[PDB]
Design a protein around this ligand. Structure first.
Ligand code: SF4
Ligand code: SF4
Ligand code: SF4
Lengths: 184, 57, 111, 148, 161, 212, 69, 392
């Protein structure tokens, strides 16, 4: 009756009263967000950005092809029987076909192939991603050496205790590499 | 000191993600040097600004 | 039902079109080559793909009317338009907003 | 400022090799290759890391090796030289073409200077190498940018 | 014979259902060959024995031109177990006439798993409800995952050029 | 011949004359489309999680002006985030034709560029989304970082500003219709809308339950 | 006669009668008859052929194969 | 045009499907407000994974596998490397075994968090969808540090163990993360157990009995949410999961509310297994493992077959031995098994992925029997589906 709609309305109109308060307290917190083109976030030490190449190191043995999941890197080599050693003449990894699993940088004896940190490769043409040996041998783009980007760090790289990379004035990783060489 | 392409340097500055990692440098250019870090499984070279790299014998 | 075979360059529908609205038929197949203008056509090669479209419709007129069989006709037309590029009959359109070169890049013949 | 005229087209005919410093969120660089395209100049927007040696790519033919993906032989696709194949398709009633290289900031200074000295030895051809970033889009020649 | 039986093979021997017992697995389960005429007689006894959970109804090709196999790796599920007894029933079927009777009414997990065996391999399951193609278009004609499957020359399946 | 897959010479002069006023209206025309373009909430394979991580709090989707729409008509951009097979290949063209003409498809991941890891041996994967729909910006990666998609938005935003207002005519499809009559037998559809109420699930048939 | 690693071509008469024709479509694609497929891993009477198209390799009989010189 | 008839109306859910669990297509037919039948059309993400593996070596197929259950990631690499290492008898070191427990329990948290966000938006309140993905971004950077990628394409699992050891500031960064995330697990639980409007959409909505769950074929938090207590980490003594004390989350109700509380309790039990593995690590932290490598580098209790990330780094030409096999890994979504039979060469002869979601999606027509139209995405969001695992 009329003595119920003043009591059946309170049970949830105050629950949204204790729900409007917590959502207004969500606006109290600082926006934890990575504004991209002015704060690019630093990749990790193992991040597989894109493959680098050393033309003065690749001795023509096609281990990168046999360990690739799709046998992608084109190794163009002649035998060169006047010197009795195979010397390559062209090398290309067609990115866009490349999944960045980096089996080629792992199974290489001469340490030629290597992953960079640049993920910012995006062309208007599919065939502009077929990188040459001298286009893969170009120097990577470091996030820190850019005078428009304030590079914020990643989680598992902050000091121990903080879970954000914005109000971080200094510091390093949460452990030491060689702290125990003169201790033990 | 100057850097030749193939010496083992290590990073010295503290305001960097790679604090004291060491490795072979590769493809030195007009103001930049990339140091192959030899880290664990996937070898990674990172550009630097031709300084804060103290080599070891 | 509108069984159709829509690749980039070949849009084969099972039906006839009356002013945009496609009506599903049983007897006919409609085809418009290059809905997007990626290739600059001419009057010669547009009839050359009609020597291929009505050839493959007459050839596969003993099979079933499925989306698999329309895709087999629409694939062999798309393998025929690519042969017209390698013969140098038609060329890529430059007034198009995209220049992604789906049927291979321009390349010279025998280095 | 905001109301931009056609000073970007006149600076490109003067220098021949510009170097834009655009905002890194994009959208404001392309308003100047519309003033460029309104004055008859066609535009080939390429990607600066995707090019190999610019001598062997732009003015010389290059053998592009496609992805054989383990199920093909090593094919060599000899593409035509880029700046001198897009010049011959360009009709002589219109002006030259411009190379709108994006992500120019991963090009070396030896490749910056090669794009600078090529625009005068090759007639009706210019470059605009989008290198670096700035809060306001601004340009300068490539001759003194390599002298920085 | 040459190969002895196991704990499941001696149960089927005690119910007058002769099965060609293969050896043990590389992990240690029993492999049992059952003909397609005596499959529903064998699996009805194993379901009443306690094998209430079938997993990985896997069709398998013994080689090109050889006999197709439909395997049934059925386990004895309980409320709490520590390596419960499992057995894999393999049913060989020829390429021509590839019919194996469906075990949907015994285990309902062989509804989509036998459809996947019919979608890829050509194994038609008699008595199977809604036997169609799941993973492929329903108007596809070939049988992939066989060694003999010649993939058609579709424009979409070619290289990116 | 002379050159394989040639470039057709543009015989039109492209007399793109304009004053200060009409290009000032063309800047507002291009800015309004680059700065608030709405992507379709589309995703098939793994690259939708990297696209949905960009919807979230750490990377801001609605910061460039990108509002995800779960409808093809309200959206213009469509980020193809996922491997498309032979199925979803007619469904993605249908999502593409139901859009207003400033569309600007961008391909995301390796499997919308060349069908990346399934480009070697897969019987049902279309190798690259550019075998079905025209692509504006390509984006390699497997999967790309959410920062790497926001570069492809920035590369896309530089392409909207190059679009001219008097070149709005090529955005509509040309219609070179042709017609041929066939003699293929029509088939009843395989997937009718009954699964549980089909007359084969209620009871096992005879000549098979005798041996059960 | 057919070694492992030479270019073979598929004959159409001996293919569309046998057990290898049940798995595929009856309308055979044209890459089989252009002789470019490299045979790898011959196993008894059958042979796996890596054709130049980016599709999965097929296993065909050695009687259904002709060497393409 | 559209007419108004009296027969039951069939609506197509469509392969567009703007949701985060893949691309389904449900031809669900309606009876006004109740559904009467529904067929699921799958295969829109069938890339032919089983035909690929017959032309891949194991190191060439390890990048391929973390795309079936791409919410999980390394749960797919767990089953993959366990198929030849349990067939060739290759010993895995003890330290690399505990890193596998550390990585898999973090994947199950990320598996459940990707399930949780879309599920809370489908059942009502949409505001935790943006706060749950923030918690998954901490798990991304824990994999981005140790491996080279965020959640998938992380070639970490190997045949002789694991790819590399952890980073330096890693073990102290679950102690920042999984000591901060564990207070939020009970916060996610009190969203549905409290506010009793969500329980009127999940009690009895999509209920499955215990006897029908074993017969239809179920695993993980859909089988165990009917009162079965079947967990393959407990049932199969799988890779030093038996060295910890942790309870199997069971809820004998069958409904979608039972599936919610189990998956929340799987998040809570995963942090228990994590903290018992970070402290039960054989060499402990890698910066302290490497510390003993320099003080006692000649011959110590360390530098053994254990206390290292791989047994022997195998060649790319690693031949799988001959024999059938079936390895099981309790994923976050159920039992992910593969039926490996290999010849003596480097390619396996048959690689039948038995997915955890392919066998749980076949019950979705039976769960959508008598349920309403607004409770269709409430059912499908609670099966924890990833299409790509279903279709492969
Ligand atoms: S893997 Fe290394 S050594 Fe082998 S071909 Fe490639 S670059 Fe040369
Ligand atoms: S990243 Fe992967 S696909 Fe690319 S070259 Fe390395 S192994 Fe091959
Ligand atoms: S390349 Fe990998 S991440 Fe990208 S769409 Fe394909 S499966 Fe997904």
């Amino acid at each position: 009756q009329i003595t119920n709609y003043a009591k059946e309305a309170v049970q949830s109109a105050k629950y949204i009263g204790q729900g409007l308060s917590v959502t207004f307290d969500h606006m109290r917190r600082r926006p934890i967000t990575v504004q991209y083109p002015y704060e690019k976030l630093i990749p990790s030490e193992r991040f597989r950005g894109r493959i680098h190449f050393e033309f003065d190191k690749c001795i023509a043995c096609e281990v990168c092809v046999r360990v690739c999941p799709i046998n992608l890197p084109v190794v163009d080599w002649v035998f060169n029987k006047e010197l009795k050693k195979k010397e390559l003449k062209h090398y290309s990894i067609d990115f866009g076909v490349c999944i960045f699993c980096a089996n080629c940088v792992e199974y290489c004896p001469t340490n030629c192939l290597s992953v960079t940190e640049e993920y910012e490769l995006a062309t208007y043409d599919r065939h502009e991603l077929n990188y040459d040996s001298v286009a893969m041998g170009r120097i990577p783009y470091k996030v820190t050496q850019d005078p428009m980007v304030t590079p914020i760090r990643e989680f598992a790289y902050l000091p121990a205790g903080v879970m954000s990379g914005h109000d971080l004035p200094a510091g390093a990783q949460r452990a030491g590499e060689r702290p125990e060489a003169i201790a033990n | 000191m100057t850097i030749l392409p193939g010496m083992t340097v290590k990073v010295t500055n503290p305001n960097d993600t790679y604090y004291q990692f060491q490795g072979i440098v590769q493809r030195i250019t007009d103001g930049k040097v990339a140091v192959l870090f030899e880290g664990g499984n996937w070898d990674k070279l990172v550009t630097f600004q031709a300084s804060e790299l103290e080599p070891v014998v | 039902m509108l069984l159709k075979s829509t690749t980039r360059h070949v849009h084969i529908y099972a039906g006839h079109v009356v002013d945009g609205e496609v009506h599903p038929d049983t007897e006919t197949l409609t085809l418009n080559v290059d809905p997007d203008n990626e290739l600059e056509w001419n009057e010669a090669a547009l009839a050359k793909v009609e020597a291929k479209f009505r050839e493959l419709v007459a050839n596969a007129a003993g099979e079933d009317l499925t989306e698999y069989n329309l895709r087999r006709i629409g694939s062999d037309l798309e393998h025929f338009i690519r042969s017209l590029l390698m013969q140098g009959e038609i060329g890529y359109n430059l007034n198009s907003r995209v220049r992604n070169y789906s049927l291979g890049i321009p390349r010279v013949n025998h280095s | 400022g905001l109301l931009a005229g056609y000073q970007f087209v006149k600076d490109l005919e003067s220098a021949g090799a510009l170097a834009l410093f655009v905002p890194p969120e994009g959208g404001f660089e392309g308003r100047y290759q519309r003033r460029l395209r309104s004055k008859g100049y066609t535009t080939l927007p390429m990607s600066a890391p995707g090019l190999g040696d610019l001598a062997a790519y732009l003015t010389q033919e290059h053998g592009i090796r496609p992805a054989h993906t383990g199920k093909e032989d090593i094919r060599v696709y000899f593409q035509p030289p880029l700046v001198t194949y897009h010049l011959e398709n360009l009709p002589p009633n219109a002006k030259g073409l411009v190379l709108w290289l994006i992500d120019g900031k991963r090009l070396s200074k030896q490749e910056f200077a090669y794009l600078a000295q090529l625009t005068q030895t090759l007639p009706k051809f210019k470059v605009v190498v989008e290198v670096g970033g700035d809060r306001v889009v601004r340009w300068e020649p490539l001759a003194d940018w390599v002298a920085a | 014979p040459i190969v002895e039986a196991g704990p499941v093979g001696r149960l089927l021997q005690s119910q007058n259902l002769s099965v060609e017992s293969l050896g043990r697995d590389a992990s240690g389960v029993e492999m049992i060959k059952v003909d397609r005429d005596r499959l529903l007689a064998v699996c009805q006894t194993l379901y009443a024995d306690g094998f209430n959970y079938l997993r990985c109804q896997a069709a398998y090709d013994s080689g090109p031109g050889q006999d197709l196999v439909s395997t049934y790796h059925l386990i004895k599920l309980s409320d709490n177990a520590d390596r419960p007894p499992e057995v894999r029933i393999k049913v060989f079927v020829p390429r021509d006439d590839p019919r194996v009777p469906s075990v949907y009414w015994i285990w309902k997990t062989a509804d989509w798993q036998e459809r996947e065996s019919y979608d890829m391999f050509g194994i038609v399951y008699e008595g199977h409800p809604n036997l169609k193609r799941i993973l492929m278009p329903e108007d596809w004609v070939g049988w992939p995952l066989r060694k003999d499957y010649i993939t058609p020359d579709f424009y979409e399946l070619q290289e990116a050029y | 011949p002379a050159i394989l897959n040639p470039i057709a010479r543009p015989e039109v002069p492209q007399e793109l004359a304009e004053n200060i006023i009409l290009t000032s209206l063309n800047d507002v025309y291009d800015w309004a489309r680059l700065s608030s373009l709405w992507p379709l909430m589309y995703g098939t394979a793994c690259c939708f999680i990297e696209f949905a991580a960009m919807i979230g709090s750490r990377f801001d989707f609605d910061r460039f002006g990108l509002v995800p729409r779960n409808s093809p008509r309200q959206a213009d951009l469509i980020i193809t985030s996922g491997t498309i097979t032979m199925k979803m290949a007619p469904a993605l063209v249908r999502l593409y034709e139901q859009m207003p003409s400033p569309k600007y498809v961008i391909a995301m991941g390796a499997c919308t560029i060349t069908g990346g890891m399934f480009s070697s041996d897969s019987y049902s994967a279309v190798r690259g989304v550019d075998k079905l729909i025209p692509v504006d910006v390509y984006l390699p990666g497997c999967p790309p970082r959410p920062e790497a998609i926001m570069d492809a938005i920035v590369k896309l935003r530089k392409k909207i500003a190059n679009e001219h207002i008097n070149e709005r005519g090529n955005l509509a499809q040309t219609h070179r219709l042709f017609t041929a009559k066939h003699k293929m037998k029509p088939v009843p559809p395989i997937l009718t809308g009954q699964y549980l109420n089909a007359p084969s699930r209620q009871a096992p048939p005879p000549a098979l339950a005798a041996a059960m | 006669a057919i070694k492992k690693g030479d270019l073979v071509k598929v004959v159409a008469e001996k293919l569309a009668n046998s057990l290898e024709a049940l798995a595929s479509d009856h309308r055979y694609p044209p890459y089989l008859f252009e002789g470019r497929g490299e045979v790898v891993d011959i196993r008894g009477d059958y042979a796996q052929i890596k054709f130049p198209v980016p599709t999965p390799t097929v296993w065909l009989r050695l009687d259904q194969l002709e060497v393409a010189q | 045009k559209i007419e108004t008839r009296t027969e039951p109306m069939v609506i197509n859910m469509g392969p567009h499907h703007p949701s985060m669990h893949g691309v389904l297509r449900l031809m669900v037919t309606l009876d006004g407000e109740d559904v009467i039948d529904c067929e699921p059309v799958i295969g829109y993400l069938h890339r032919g994974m089983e035909k690929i593996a017959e032309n891949r070596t194991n190191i060439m197929f390890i990048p391929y596998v973390s795309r079936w259950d791409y919410a999980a990631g390394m749960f797919n690499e767990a089953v993959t490397v366990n198929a030849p290492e349990k067939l060739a008898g290759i010993p895995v070191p003890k330290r690399a075994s505990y890193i596998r427990v550390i990585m898999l329990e973090l994947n199950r948290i990320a598996n459940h968090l990707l399930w949780l966000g879309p599920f809370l938006a489908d059942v009502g309140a949409q505001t935790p969808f943006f706060y749950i993905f923030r918690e998954r971004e901490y798990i991304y950077d824990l994999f981005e540090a140790a491996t080279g990628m965020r959640f998938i394409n992380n070639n970490y699992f190997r045949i002789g163990g694991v790819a590399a050891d952890l980073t330096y500031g890693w073990v102290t960064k679950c102690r920042d993360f999984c000591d901060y995330f564990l207070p939020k697990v009970d916060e996610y639980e009190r969203l549905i157990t409290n506010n009793p409007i969500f329980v009127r959409r999940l009690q009895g909505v999509g209920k499955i009995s215990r006897e029908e769950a074993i017969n239809w074929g179920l695993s993980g938090p859909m089988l165990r949410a009917s009162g079965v207590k079947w967990d393959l980490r407990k049932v199969d003594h799988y890779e030093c999961y038996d060295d910890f004390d942790w309870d199997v989350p069971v809820a004998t109700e069958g409904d979608c509310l039972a599936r919610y509380i189990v998956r929340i309790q799987e998040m809570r039990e995963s942090v228990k297994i994590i903290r018992q593995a970070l402290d039960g690590l054989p060499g402990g932290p890698y910066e302290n493992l490497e510390a003993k490598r320099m003080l006692e580098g000649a011959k110590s209790e360390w530098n053994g077959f254990d206390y290292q990330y791989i047994g022997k780094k195998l060649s790319p030409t690693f031949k799988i031995p001959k024999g059938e096999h079936y390895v099981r890994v309790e994923s976050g979504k159920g039992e992910l098994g593969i039926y490996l039979i290999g010849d003596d060469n480097v390619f396996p002869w048959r690689w039948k992925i038995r997915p955890p979601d392919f066998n749980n999606l076949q019950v979705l027509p039976q769960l959508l029997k008598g349920m309403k139209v607004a409770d269709i995405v409430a059912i499908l969001g609670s099966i924890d589906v990833i299409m790509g695992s279903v279709d492969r």
